[PDB]
PDB file of C-alpha atoms and ligand atoms in Angstrom:
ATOM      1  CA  UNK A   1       0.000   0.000   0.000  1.00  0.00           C
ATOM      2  CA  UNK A   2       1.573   3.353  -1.522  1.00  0.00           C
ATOM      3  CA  UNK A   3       0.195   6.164   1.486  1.00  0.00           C
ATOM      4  CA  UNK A   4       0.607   9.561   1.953  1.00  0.00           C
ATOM      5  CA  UNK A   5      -0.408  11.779   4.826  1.00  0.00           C
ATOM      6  CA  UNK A   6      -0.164  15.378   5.750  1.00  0.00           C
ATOM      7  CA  UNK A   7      -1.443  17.172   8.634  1.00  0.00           C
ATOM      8  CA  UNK A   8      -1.183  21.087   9.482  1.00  0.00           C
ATOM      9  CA  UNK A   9      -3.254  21.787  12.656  1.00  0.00           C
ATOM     10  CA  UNK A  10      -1.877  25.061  12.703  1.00  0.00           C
ATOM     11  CA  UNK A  11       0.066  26.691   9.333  1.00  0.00           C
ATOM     12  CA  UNK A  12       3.656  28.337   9.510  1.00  0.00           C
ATOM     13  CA  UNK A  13       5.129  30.785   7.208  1.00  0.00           C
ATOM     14  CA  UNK A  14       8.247  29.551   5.550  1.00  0.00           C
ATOM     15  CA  UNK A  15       6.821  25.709   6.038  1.00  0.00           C
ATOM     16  CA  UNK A  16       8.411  24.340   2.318  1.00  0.00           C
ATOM     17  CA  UNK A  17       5.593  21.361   2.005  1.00  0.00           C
ATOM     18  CA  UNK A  18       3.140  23.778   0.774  1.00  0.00           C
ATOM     19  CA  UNK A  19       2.793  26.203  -2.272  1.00  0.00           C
ATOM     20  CA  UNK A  20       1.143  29.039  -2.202  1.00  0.00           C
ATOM     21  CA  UNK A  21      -0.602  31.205  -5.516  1.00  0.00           C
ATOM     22  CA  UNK A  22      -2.121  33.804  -6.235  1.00  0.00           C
ATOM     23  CA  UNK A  23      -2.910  36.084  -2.963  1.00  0.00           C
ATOM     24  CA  UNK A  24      -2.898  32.987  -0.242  1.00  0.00           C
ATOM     25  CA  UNK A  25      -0.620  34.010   2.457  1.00  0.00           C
ATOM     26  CA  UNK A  26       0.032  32.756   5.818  1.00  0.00           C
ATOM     27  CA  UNK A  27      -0.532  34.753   8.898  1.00  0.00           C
ATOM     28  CA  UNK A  28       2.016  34.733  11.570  1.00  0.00           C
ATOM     29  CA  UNK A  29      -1.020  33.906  13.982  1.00  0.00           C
ATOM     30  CA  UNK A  30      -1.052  30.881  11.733  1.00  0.00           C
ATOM     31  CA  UNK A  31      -3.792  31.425   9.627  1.00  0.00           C
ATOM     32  CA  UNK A  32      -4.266  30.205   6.184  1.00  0.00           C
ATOM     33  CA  UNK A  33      -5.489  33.239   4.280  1.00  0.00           C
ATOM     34  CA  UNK A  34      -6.823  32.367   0.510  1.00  0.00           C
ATOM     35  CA  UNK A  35      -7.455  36.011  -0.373  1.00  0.00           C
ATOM     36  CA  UNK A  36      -6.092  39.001  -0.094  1.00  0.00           C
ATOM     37  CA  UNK A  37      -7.354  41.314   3.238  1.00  0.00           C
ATOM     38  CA  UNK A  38      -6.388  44.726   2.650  1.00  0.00           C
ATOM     39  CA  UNK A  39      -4.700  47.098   5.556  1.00  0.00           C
ATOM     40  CA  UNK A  40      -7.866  48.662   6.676  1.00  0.00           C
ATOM     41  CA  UNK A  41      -8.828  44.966   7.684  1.00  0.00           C
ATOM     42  CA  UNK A  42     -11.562  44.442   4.955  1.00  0.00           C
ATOM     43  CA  UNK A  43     -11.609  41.918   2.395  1.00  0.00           C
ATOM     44  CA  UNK A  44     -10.297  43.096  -1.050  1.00  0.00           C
ATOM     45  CA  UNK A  45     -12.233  41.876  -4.373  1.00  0.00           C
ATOM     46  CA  UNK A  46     -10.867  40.236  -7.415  1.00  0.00           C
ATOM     47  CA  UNK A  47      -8.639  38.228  -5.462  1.00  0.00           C
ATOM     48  CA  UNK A  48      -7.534  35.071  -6.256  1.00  0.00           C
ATOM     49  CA  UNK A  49      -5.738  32.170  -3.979  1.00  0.00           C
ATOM     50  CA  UNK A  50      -4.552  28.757  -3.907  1.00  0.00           C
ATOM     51  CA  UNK A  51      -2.659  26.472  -2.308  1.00  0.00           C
ATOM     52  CA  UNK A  52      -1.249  23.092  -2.832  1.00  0.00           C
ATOM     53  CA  UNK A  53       0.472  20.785  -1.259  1.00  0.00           C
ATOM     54  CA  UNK A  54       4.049  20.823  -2.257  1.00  0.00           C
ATOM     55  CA  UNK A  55       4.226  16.850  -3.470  1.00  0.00           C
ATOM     56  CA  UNK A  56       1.428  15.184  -5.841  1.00  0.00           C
ATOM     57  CA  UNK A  57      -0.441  12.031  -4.666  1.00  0.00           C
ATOM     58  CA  UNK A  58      -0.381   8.590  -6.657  1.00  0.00           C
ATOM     59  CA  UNK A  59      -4.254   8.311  -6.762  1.00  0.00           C
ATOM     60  CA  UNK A  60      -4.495   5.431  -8.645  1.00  0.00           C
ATOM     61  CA  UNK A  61      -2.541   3.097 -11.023  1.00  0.00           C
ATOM     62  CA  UNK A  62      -2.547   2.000 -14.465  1.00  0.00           C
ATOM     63  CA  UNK A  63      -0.385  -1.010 -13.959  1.00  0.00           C
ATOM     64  CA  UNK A  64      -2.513  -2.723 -11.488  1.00  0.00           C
ATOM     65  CA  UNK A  65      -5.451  -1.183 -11.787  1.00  0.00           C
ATOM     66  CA  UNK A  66      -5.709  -0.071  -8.332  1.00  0.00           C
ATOM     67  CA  UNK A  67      -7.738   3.479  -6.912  1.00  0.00           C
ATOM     68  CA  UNK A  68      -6.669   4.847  -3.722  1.00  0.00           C
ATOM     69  CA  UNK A  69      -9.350   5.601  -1.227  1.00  0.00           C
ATOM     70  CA  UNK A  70      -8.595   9.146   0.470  1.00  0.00           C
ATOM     71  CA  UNK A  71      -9.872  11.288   3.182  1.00  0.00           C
ATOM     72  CA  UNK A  72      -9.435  15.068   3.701  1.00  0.00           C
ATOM     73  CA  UNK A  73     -10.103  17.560   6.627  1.00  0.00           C
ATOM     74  CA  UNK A  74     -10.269  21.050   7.003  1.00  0.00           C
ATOM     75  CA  UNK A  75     -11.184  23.992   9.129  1.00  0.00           C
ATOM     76  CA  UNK A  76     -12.467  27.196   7.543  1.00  0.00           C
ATOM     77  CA  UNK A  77     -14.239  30.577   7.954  1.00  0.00           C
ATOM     78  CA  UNK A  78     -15.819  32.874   5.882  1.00  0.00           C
ATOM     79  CA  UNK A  79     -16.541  36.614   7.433  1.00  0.00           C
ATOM     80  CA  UNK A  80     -19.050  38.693   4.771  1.00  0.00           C
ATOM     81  CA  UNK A  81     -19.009  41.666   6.196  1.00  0.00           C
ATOM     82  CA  UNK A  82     -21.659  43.814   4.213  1.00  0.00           C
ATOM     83  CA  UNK A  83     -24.945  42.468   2.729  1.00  0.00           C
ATOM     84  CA  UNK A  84     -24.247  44.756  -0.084  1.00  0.00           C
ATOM     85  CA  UNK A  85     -23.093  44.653  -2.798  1.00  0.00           C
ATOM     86  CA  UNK A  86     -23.571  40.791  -2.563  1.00  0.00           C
ATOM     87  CA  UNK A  87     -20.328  38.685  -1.567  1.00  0.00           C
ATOM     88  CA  UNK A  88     -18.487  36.298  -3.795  1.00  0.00           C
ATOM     89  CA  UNK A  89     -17.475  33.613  -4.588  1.00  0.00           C
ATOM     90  CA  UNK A  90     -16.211  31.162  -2.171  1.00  0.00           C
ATOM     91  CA  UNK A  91     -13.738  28.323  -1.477  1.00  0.00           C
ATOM     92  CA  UNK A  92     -13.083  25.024  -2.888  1.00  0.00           C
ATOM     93  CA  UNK A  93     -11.038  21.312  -2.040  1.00  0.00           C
ATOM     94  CA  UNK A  94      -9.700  20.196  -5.451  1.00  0.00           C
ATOM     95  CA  UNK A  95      -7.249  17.508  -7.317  1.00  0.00           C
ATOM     96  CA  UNK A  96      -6.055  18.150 -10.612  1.00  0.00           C
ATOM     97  CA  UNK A  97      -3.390  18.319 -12.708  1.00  0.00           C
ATOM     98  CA  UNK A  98       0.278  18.085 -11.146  1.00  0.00           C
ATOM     99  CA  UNK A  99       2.233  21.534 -11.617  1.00  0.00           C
ATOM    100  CA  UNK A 100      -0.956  23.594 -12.205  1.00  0.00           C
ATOM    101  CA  UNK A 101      -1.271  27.234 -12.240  1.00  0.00           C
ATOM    102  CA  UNK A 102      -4.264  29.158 -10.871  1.00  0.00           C
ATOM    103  CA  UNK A 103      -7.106  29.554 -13.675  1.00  0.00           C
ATOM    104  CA  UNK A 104      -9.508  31.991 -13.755  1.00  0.00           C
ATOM    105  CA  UNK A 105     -11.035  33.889 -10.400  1.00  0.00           C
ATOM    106  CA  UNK A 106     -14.288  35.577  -9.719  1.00  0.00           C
ATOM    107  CA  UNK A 107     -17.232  32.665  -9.925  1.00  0.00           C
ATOM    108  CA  UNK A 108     -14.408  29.935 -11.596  1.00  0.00           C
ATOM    109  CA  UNK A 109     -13.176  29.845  -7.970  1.00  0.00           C
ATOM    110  CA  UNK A 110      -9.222  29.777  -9.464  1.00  0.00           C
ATOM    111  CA  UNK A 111      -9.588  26.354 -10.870  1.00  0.00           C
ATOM    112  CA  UNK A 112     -11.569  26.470 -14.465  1.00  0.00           C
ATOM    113  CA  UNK A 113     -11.971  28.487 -17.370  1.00  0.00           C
ATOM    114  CA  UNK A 114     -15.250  28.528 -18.281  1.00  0.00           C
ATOM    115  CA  UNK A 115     -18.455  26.944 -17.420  1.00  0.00           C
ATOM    116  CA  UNK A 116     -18.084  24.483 -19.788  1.00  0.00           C
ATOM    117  CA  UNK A 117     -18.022  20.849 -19.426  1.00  0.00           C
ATOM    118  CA  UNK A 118     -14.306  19.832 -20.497  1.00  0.00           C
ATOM    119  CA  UNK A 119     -12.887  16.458 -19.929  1.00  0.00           C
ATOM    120  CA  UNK A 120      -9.679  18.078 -20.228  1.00  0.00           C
ATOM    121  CA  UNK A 121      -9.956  20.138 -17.078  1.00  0.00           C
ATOM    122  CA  UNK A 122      -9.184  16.663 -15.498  1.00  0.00           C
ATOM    123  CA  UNK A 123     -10.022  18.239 -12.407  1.00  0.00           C
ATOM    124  CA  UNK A 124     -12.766  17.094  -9.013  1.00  0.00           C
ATOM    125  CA  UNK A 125     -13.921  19.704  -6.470  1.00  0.00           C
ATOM    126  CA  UNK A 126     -15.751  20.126  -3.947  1.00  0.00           C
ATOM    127  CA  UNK A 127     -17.025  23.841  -3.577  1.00  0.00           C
ATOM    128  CA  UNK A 128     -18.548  26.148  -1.101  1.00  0.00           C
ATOM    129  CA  UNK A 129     -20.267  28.560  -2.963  1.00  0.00           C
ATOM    130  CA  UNK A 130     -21.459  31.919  -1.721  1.00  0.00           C
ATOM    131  CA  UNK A 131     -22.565  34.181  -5.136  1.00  0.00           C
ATOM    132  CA  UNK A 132     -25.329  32.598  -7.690  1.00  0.00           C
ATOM    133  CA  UNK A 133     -23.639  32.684 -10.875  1.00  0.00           C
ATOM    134  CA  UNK A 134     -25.483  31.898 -14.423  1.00  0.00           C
ATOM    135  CA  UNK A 135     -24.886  28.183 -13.951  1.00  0.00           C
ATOM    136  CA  UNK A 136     -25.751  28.208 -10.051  1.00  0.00           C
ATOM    137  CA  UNK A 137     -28.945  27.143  -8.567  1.00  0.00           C
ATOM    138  CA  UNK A 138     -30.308  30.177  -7.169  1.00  0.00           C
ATOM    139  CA  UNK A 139     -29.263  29.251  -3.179  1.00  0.00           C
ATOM    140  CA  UNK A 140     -26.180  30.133  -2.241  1.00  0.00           C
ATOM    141  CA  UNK A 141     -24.577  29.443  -0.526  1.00  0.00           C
ATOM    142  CA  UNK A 142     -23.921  25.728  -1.296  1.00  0.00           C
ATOM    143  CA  UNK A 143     -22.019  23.084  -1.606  1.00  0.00           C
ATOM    144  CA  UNK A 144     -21.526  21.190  -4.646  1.00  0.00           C
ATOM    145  CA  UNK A 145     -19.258  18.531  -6.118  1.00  0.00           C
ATOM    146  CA  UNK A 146     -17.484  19.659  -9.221  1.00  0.00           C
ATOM    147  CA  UNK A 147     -16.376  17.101 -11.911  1.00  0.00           C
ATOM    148  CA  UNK A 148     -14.764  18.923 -15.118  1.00  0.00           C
ATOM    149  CA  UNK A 149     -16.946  21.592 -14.667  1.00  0.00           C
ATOM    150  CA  UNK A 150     -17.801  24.625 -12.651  1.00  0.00           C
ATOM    151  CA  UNK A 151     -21.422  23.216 -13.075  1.00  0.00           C
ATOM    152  CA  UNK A 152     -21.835  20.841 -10.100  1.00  0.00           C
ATOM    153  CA  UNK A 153     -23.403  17.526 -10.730  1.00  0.00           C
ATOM    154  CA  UNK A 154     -24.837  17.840  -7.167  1.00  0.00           C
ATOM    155  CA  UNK A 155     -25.070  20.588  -5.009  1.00  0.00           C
ATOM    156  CA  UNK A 156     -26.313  20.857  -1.220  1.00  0.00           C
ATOM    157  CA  UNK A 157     -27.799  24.507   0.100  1.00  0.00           C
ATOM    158  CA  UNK A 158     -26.567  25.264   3.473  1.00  0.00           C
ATOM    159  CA  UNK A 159     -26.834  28.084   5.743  1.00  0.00           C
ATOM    160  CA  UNK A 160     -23.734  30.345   6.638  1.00  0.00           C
ATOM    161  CA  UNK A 161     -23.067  30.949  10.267  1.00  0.00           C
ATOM    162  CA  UNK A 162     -21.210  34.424   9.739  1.00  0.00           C
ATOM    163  CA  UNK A 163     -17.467  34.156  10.475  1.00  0.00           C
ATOM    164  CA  UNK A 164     -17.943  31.229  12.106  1.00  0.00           C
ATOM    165  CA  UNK A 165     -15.201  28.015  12.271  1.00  0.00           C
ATOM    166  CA  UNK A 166     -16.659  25.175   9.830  1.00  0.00           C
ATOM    167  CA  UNK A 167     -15.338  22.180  10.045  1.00  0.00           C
ATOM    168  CA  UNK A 168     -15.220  20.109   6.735  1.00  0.00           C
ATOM    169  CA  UNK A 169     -14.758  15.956   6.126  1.00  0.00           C
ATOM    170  CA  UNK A 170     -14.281  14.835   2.624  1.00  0.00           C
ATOM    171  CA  UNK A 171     -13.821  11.385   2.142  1.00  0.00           C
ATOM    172  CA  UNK A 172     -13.548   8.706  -1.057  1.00  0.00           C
ATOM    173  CA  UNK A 173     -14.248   4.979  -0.764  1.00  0.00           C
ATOM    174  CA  UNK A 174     -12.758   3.545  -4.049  1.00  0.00           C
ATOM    175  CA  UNK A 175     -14.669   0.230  -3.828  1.00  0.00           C
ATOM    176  CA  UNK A 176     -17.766   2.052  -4.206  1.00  0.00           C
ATOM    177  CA  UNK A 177     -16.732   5.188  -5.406  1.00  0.00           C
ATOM    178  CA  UNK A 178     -18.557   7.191  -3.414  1.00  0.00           C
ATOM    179  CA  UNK A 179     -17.232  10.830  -2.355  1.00  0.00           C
ATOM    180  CA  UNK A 180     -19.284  11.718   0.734  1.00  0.00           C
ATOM    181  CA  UNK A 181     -18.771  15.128   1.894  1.00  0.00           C
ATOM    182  CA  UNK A 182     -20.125  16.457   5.749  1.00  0.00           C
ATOM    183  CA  UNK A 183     -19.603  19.982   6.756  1.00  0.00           C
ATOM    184  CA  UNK A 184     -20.570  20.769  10.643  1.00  0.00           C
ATOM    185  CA  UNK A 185     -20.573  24.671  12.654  1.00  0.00           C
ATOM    186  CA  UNK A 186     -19.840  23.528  16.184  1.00  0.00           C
ATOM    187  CA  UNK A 187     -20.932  27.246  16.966  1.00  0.00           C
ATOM    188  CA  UNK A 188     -24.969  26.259  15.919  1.00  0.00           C
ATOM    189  CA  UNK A 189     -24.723  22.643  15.520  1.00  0.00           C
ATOM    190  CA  UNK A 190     -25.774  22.468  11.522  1.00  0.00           C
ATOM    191  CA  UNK A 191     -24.957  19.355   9.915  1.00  0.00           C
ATOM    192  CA  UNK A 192     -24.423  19.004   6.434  1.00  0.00           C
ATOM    193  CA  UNK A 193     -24.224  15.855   4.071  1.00  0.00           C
ATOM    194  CA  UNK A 194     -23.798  15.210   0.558  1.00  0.00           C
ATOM    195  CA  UNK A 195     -22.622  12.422  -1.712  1.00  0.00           C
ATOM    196  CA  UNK A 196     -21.986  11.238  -5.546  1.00  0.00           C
ATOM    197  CA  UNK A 197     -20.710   8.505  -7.149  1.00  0.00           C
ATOM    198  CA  UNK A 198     -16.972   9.652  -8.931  1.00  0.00           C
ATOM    199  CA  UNK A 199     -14.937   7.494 -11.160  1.00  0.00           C
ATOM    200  CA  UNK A 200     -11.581   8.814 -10.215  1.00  0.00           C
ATOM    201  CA  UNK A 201      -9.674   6.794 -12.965  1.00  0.00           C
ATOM    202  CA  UNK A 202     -12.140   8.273 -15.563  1.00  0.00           C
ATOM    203  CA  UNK A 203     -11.517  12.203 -14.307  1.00  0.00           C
ATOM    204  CA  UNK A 204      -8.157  12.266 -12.698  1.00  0.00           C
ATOM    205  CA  UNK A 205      -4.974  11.358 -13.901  1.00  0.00           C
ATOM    206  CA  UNK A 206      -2.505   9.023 -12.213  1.00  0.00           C
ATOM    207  CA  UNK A 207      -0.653  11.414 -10.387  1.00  0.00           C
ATOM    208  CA  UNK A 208      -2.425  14.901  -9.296  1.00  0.00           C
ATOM    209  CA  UNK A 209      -1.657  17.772  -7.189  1.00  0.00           C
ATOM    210  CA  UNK A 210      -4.103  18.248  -3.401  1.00  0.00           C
ATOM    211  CA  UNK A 211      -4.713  21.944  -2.827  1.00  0.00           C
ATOM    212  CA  UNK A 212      -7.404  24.712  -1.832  1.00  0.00           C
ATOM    213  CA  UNK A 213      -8.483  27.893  -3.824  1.00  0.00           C
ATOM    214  CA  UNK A 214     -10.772  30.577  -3.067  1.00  0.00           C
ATOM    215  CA  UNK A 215     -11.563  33.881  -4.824  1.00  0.00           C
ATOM    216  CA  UNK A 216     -13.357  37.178  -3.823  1.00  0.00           C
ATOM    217  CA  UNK A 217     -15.775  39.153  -6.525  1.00  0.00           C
ATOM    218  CA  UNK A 218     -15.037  41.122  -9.709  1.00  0.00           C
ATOM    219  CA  UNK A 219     -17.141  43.643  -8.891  1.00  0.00           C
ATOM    220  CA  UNK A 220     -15.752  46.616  -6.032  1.00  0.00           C
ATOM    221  CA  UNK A 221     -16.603  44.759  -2.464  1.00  0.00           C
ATOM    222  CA  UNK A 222     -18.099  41.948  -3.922  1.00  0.00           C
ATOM    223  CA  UNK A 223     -16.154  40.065  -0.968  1.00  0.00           C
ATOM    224  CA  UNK A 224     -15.177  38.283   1.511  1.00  0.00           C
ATOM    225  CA  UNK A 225     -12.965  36.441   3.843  1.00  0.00           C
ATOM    226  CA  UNK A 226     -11.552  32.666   2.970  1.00  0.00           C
ATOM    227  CA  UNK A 227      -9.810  31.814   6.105  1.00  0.00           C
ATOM    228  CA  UNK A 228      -8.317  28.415   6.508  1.00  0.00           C
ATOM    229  CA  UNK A 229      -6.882  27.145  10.675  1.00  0.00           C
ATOM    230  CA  UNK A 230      -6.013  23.654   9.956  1.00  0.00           C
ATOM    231  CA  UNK A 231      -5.994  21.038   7.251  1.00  0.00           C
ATOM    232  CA  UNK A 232      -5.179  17.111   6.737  1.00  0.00           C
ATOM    233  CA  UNK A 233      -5.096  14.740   3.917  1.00  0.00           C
ATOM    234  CA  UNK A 234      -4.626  10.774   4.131  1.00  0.00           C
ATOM    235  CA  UNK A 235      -4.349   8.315   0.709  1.00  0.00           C
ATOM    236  CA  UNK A 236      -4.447   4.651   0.250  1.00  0.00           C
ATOM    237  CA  UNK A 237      -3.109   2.798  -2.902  1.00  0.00           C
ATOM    238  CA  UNK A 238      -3.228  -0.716  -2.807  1.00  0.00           C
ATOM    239  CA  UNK A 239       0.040  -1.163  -4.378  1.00  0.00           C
ATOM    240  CA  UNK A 240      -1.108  -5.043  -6.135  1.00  0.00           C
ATOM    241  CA  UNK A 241      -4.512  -6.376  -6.729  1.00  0.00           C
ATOM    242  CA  UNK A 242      -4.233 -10.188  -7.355  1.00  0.00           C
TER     243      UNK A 242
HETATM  244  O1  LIG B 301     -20.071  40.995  -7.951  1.00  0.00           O
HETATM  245  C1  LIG B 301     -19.256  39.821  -7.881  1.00  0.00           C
HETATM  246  C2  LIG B 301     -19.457  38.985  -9.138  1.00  0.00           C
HETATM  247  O2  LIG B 301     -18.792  39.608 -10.235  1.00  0.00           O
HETATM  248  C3  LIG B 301     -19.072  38.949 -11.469  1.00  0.00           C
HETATM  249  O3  LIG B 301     -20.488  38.887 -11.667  1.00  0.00           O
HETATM  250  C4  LIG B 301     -18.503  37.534 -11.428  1.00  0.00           C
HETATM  251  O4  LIG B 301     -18.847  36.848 -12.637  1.00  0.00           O
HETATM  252  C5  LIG B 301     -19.046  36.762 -10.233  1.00  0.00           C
HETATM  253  O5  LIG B 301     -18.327  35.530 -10.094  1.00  0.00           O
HETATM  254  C6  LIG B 301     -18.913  37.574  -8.950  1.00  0.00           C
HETATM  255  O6  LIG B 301     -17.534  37.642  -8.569  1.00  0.00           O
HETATM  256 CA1  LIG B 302     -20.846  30.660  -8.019  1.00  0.00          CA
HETATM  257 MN1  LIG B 303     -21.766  26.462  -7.534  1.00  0.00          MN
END
């Protein structure tokens, strides 16, 4: 069994096992920032940030035919600070292509290019969504599973608990290919759930990078804050299948 495991309960500036993009910078109180804050302490729109971790993951193998099963965790916080003009666009977990560059911001949440449905994005996410774009069910925000396209094959509505800590569970069970997805705020007690069946060997390629992305508006204040405390990732490959 090929594994790989990473766990940051607190992020540290200078730490050389992840890569930042965009405007995702780490705090020295050891927060996770996606995008940009500006002095005065307010969010700043049409800002874009990822970050992956600094070594890809075997997810599954050609040779054998084996999928990895894999499990994430995360703990986030979004702060909208004005009602209006609406906030944008949210945070998402994704696997793609190794050595990837951010793609587009605003409502593409730094990891597509359009809203079309492209094989060639090679590329699964799982989104929280806070602005209703063209190709958004009208609730936001929500969570929805992406799969080569910004257009989620399932989404989930859920209710925002304002700068609150949300904590996040992602995991993949290869044998049935099921992604389930839970999100909990300890500070109410909401419970999310939401699952899909994903073919990993027919999205992802062999080898992909693990990261997170968010993005703010591209219209003036059309933001918001994409704070991340801690995050951990865990993958299985069964090396032979006989
Ligand atoms: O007002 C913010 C808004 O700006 C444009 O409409 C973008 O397409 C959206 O993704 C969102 O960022
Ligand atoms: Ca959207
Ligand atoms: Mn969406």
């Amino acid at each position: 069994v090929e594994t790989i495991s990473f766990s940051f309960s607190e992020f540290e500036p200078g730490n050389d096992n992840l890569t930042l993009q965009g405007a995702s910078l780490i705090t020295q109180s050891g927060v996770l920032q996606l995008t940009k804050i500006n002095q005065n302490g307010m969010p700043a729109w049409d800002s874009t940030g990822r970050t992956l971790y600094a070594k890809p993951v075997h997810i599954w193998d050609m040779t054998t035919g084996t999928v990895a099963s894999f499990e994430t965790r995360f703990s986030f916080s979004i702060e909208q600070p004005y009602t209006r003009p609406l906030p944008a666009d949210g945070l998402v977990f994704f696997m793609g292509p190794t050595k990837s560059k951010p793609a587009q911001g605003g409502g593409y949440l730094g990891i597509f290019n359009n809203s079309k449905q492209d094989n060639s994005y090679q590329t699964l996410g799982v989104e929280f969504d806070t602005f209703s774009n063209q190709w958004d069910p009208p609730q936001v925000p929500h969570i929805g599973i992406d799969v080569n396209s910004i257009r989620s094959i399932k989404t989930q509505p859920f209710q925002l608990d304002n700068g609150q800590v949300a904590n996040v569970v992602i995991k993949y069970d290869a044998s049935s290919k099921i992604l389930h997805a839970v999100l909990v705020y300890p500070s109410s007690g909401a419970i999310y759930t939401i699952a899909e069946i994903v073919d990993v060997k027919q999205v992802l390629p062999e080898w992909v990078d693990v990261g997170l992305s968010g993005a703010t508006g591209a219209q003036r204040d059309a933001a918001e804050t994409h704070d991340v405390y801690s995050w951990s990732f865990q993958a299985s490959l069964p090396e032979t299948n006989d």
